[PDB]
Design a protein around this ligand. Structure first.
Ligand SMILES: Cc1cc2nc3c(=O)[nH]c(=O)nc-3n(C[C@H](O)[C@H](O)[C@H](O)COP(=O)(O)OP(=O)(O)OC[C@H]3O[C@@H](n4cnc5c(N)ncnc54)[C@H](O)[C@@H]3O)c2cc1C
Ligand SMILES: NC(=O)c1ccc[n+]([C@@H]2O[C@H](COP(=O)([O-])OP(=O)(O)OC[C@H]3O[C@@H](n4cnc5c(N)ncnc54)[C@H](OP(=O)(O)O)[C@@H]3O)[C@@H](O)[C@H]2O)c1
Length: 528
């Protein structure tokens, strides 16, 4: 039998739509599936207050850089959520990609049929579509997780996870008169807290673990600046392609030690005050390899925190003692620390006083009871493998991807897994495009995968699968490379339990390997 489609593409985020656009451009037969109503992925689903980019607007905007929508105008340096979703909507316009997709449709199971080298894809547990290739663009921080606390449903006020804010108008942003509780202090939390506190009656922050945070330094984007940028897109494109993360920054050649304390102190101050992630991704070459170098930056930020926070007890509570700087994603913020100087904001430490349960009134903890009219769960995601974990995926010998990855992910190039022929996990585990400015990183990964499906059509090949030795060596390489950094000393979302779900070596290096595989007739894959 013959599968109907060349490929199915799961997801309508920035990765998914481009993937889908490209495939169809090459004249193949594609269907996209999105669970929500329309394109946007991250930018569709995450409508909470203060939701904002990390990455410079113009560096994230692959779609603009590649002249798909060259005339696009950014209004700020770090675009808000609504602006992003506008961009994606426009981008999809010029691609004409919507007609290729099934919206309001969820993939629930996927089964490989050895005997026909195809994939049988189940939509909302009834209908079945057949494709030669399954391509997941279901993204690294899709798949929300509620924390493991007793009695979440026992709560009688308003309550929800950050990625399912009530609504397409973000309803009830105004917390006038309300007692609000916020669980979690990651990137989401840090964006939410200063904003809610403008209107909340009382704001209690339930912080189990403190992150290192630094000033976003957002500012609006003059039309001149935007003209000066669009004129350089070719340069900006090449440049972001050459940096380890595809963010527009690169390391100082020097070590932390080749420089006297007073020279370091000056260099850090200059970064601290620079808009964006310069502090994190333009430090010294050994910020993430060398405990001593890390300590230097960590003490500087510490000191900064005690400047911005008036009461020294609160301030100490907010300074991490337990993981080196830049080991977890560094959340960037507007006026976060100053928030704690407010009379109507309370930091509740829930490591020393672990949350007992959620009651109808408020939140019980080992020490106190909090009456609350609203609770916010900024508790993050089932990272990387999470949304795949939520599809029954089955391969050769009817094995599940979940059992397959039970000891941790195993893939070649982070693109295919052994036992799962003709299946591409885009920006998935052990992938060089996951620790990235994903806007550019996944654009490039979508393009490479196109070139592999194209190589397959031309040579009439119907089957692709990693060899054992390919996959073992790769995985080995990924753990090896990761154990060398201070990223090993931490529990970020990209760690599972202590192992990595992700590839930390450099994008340009990762892509260089990929090019070396593709050139050598996809060496490491069995093809037939
Ligand atoms: C709040 C937030 C802010 C971020 N900010 C940045 C940033 O500034 N810079 C950066 O580089 N990265 C950022 N990221 C990381 C982000 O994941 C990437 O930037 C990018 O959005 C990933 O896009 P994607 O299209 O690959 O996945 P997504 O954007 O998540 O899109 C995946 C889509 O797949 C759909 N889907 C999943 N499962 C199914 C199912 N089985 N059936 C049907 N559809 C399904 C989902 O509905 C979703 O729409 C951020 C992430 C979050 C959560
Ligand atoms: N552009 C941006 O600046 C932007 C904005 C938002 C999100 N993001 C992306 O989204 C990622 C996820 O960040 P997030 O804040 O959404 O999630 P996150 O980084 O995973 O943080 C989740 C928070 O909830 C807490 N938590 C989880 N389970 C808990 C439990 N059982 N009890 C008590 N506390 C619990 C965690 O504390 P513990 O550490 O103790 O587990 C952590 O503080 C970021 O790394 C970032 O890449 C980016």
């Amino acid at each position: 039998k013959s599968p109907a489609l060349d490929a199915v593409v799961i997801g309508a985020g920035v990765t998914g739509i481009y993937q889908a656009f490209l495939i169809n451009q090459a004249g193949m037969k594609v269907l996209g599936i999105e669970a929500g109503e329309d394109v946007g992925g991250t930018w569709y689903w995450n409508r909470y207050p203060g939701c904002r980019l990390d990455t410079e607007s113009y560096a994230y905007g692959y779609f603009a850089l590649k002249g798909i929508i060259p005339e696009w105008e950014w209004s700020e340096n770090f675009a808000s959520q609504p602006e992003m979703l506008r961009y994606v909507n426009r981008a999809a316009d010029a691609m004409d990609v919507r007609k290729h997709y099934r919206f309001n449709t969820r993939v629930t199971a996927a089964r490989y049929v050895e005997n026909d080298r195809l994939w049988e894809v189940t939509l909302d547990n009834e209908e079945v579509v057949t494709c030669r290739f399954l391509i997941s663009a279901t993204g690294p921080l899709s798949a929300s997780r509620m924390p493991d606390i007793k009695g979440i449903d026992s709560f009688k006020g308003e309550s929800f996870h950050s990625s399912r804010w009530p609504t397409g108008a973000p309803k009830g942003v105004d917390f006038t008169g309300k007692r609000v509780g916020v669980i979690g202090t990651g990137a989401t939390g840090v964006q939410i807290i200063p904003i809610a506190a403008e209107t909340a009656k009382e704001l209690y922050v339930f912080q189990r673990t403190p992150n290192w945070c630094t000033p976003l330094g957002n500012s609006p984007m003059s039309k001149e600046k935007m003209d000066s940028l669009r004129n350089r897109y070719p340069t900006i494109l090449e440049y972001v392609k050459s940096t380890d993360t595809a963010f527009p920054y690169h390391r100082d050649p020097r070590k932390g030690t080749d420089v006297s304390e007073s020279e370091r102190d000056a260099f850090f101050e200059e970064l601290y005050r620079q808009p964006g992630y310069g502090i994190w991704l333009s430090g010294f070459r050994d910020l993430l390899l060398n405990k001593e170098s890390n300590k230097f930056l960590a003490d500087f930020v510490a000191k900064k925190i005690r400047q911005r926070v008036k009461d020294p007890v609160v301030a100490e509570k907010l300074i991490p003692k337990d993981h080196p700087f830049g080991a977890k994603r560094v959340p960037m913020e507007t006026n976060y620390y100053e928030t704690y100087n407010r009379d109507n904001v309370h930091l509740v430490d829930i490591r020393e006083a672990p949350i007992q349960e959620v009651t109808p009134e408020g939140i019980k903890t080992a020490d106190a009871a909090y009456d609350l009219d609203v609770i916010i769960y900024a508790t993050g995601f089932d990272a990387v493998t999470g949304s795949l974990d939520r599809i029954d995926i089955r391969g050769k010998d009817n094995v599940r991807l979940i059992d397959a990855w039970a000891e941790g992910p195993s893939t070649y190039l982070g693109l295919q897994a052994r036992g799962f022929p003709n299946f591409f996990t885009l920006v998935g585990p052990h992938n060089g495009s996951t620790f990235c400015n994903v806007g550019v990183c996944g654009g490039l990964q979508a393009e490479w995968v196109l070139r592999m499906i194209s190589y397959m059509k031309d040579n009439g090949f119907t089957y692709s699968e990693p060899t054992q030795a390919a996959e073992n060596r790769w995985t080995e390489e990924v753990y090896a490379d990761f154990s060398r950094t201070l990223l090993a000393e931490a529990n970020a979302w990209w760690v599972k339990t202590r192992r990595t779900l992700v590839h930390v070596s450099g994008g340009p290096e990762y892509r260089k390997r990929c090019e070396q595989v593709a050139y050598n007739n996809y060496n490491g894959f069995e093809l037939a």
